[PDB]
């Protein structure tokens, strides 16, 4: 497959690896997921409730569950901020 | 770097690869990009105008330009549809 197809799959599989069989993320799953996948990002938030605050932004239905589309909204927010910084300071 | 970080960097690098220094994609950039990265997707649509259908609703403003964030909404839509497919079937 292509570079994009590979990247997409890892995004798909990462979700499922942390969502388990129930097929969604709890704030616990989300926290674990970012600890393993973006530790340098958490280690730079002075805020200790930062995961909790991301959960609040993600949890639109307020049912404590975060599905794949919400997950992708997270990655979106992260990837778009990276790209913004990238353009300004790096490209 | 984690797998997700690599995935994110790949999407970011793929955008810039096909958009160039202009920092955005035209229909044609988009069309090439889809051809190089998602060939089976295009061929399964028996429509010589899929890139046009897709360009249409990325270009909410009709300026012929697709930026990174809009690009990310394309990848988001595909990956989401793949995941839905995946959940209904492949497990």
């Amino acid at each position: 497959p292509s570079q994009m197809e590979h990247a997409m799959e890892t995004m798909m599989f990462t979700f499922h690896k942390f969502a388990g069989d129930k097929g969604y993320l709890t704030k616990e799953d989300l926290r674990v997921l970012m600890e393993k996948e973006f530790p340098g990002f958490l280690e730079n938030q002075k805020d200790p409730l930062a995961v909790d605050k991301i959960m609040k932004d993600l949890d639109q239905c307020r049912d404590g569950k975060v599905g794949f589309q919400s997950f992708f909204s997270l990655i979106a927010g992260l990837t778009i901020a990276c790209n913004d910084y990238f353009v300004v300071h790096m490209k | 770097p984690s797998q997700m970080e690599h995935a994110m960097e790949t999407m970011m690098f793929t955008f810039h690869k096909f958009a160039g220094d202009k920092g955005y994609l035209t229909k044609e950039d988009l069309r090439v990009l889809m051809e190089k990265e998602f060939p089976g997707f295009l061929e399964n649509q028996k429509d010589p105008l899929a890139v046009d259908k897709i360009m249409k609703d990325l270009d909410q403003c009709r300026d012929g330009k697709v930026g990174f964030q809009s690009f990310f909404s394309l990848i988001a839509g595909l990956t989401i549809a793949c995941n839905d497919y995946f959940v209904v079937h492949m497990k």
């Binding site: 340098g40 990002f41 280690e43 805020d47 990837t79 990276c82 990238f86 790096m90 | 770097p1 960097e9």
Partner: peptide, 13 residues
């Protein structure tokens, strides 16, 4: 690894 570097320079809100 450039994403990894950029992430550590970002923040919320």
């Amino acid at each position: 690894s450039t994403v990894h570097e950029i992430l550590s320079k970002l923040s919320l809100e």
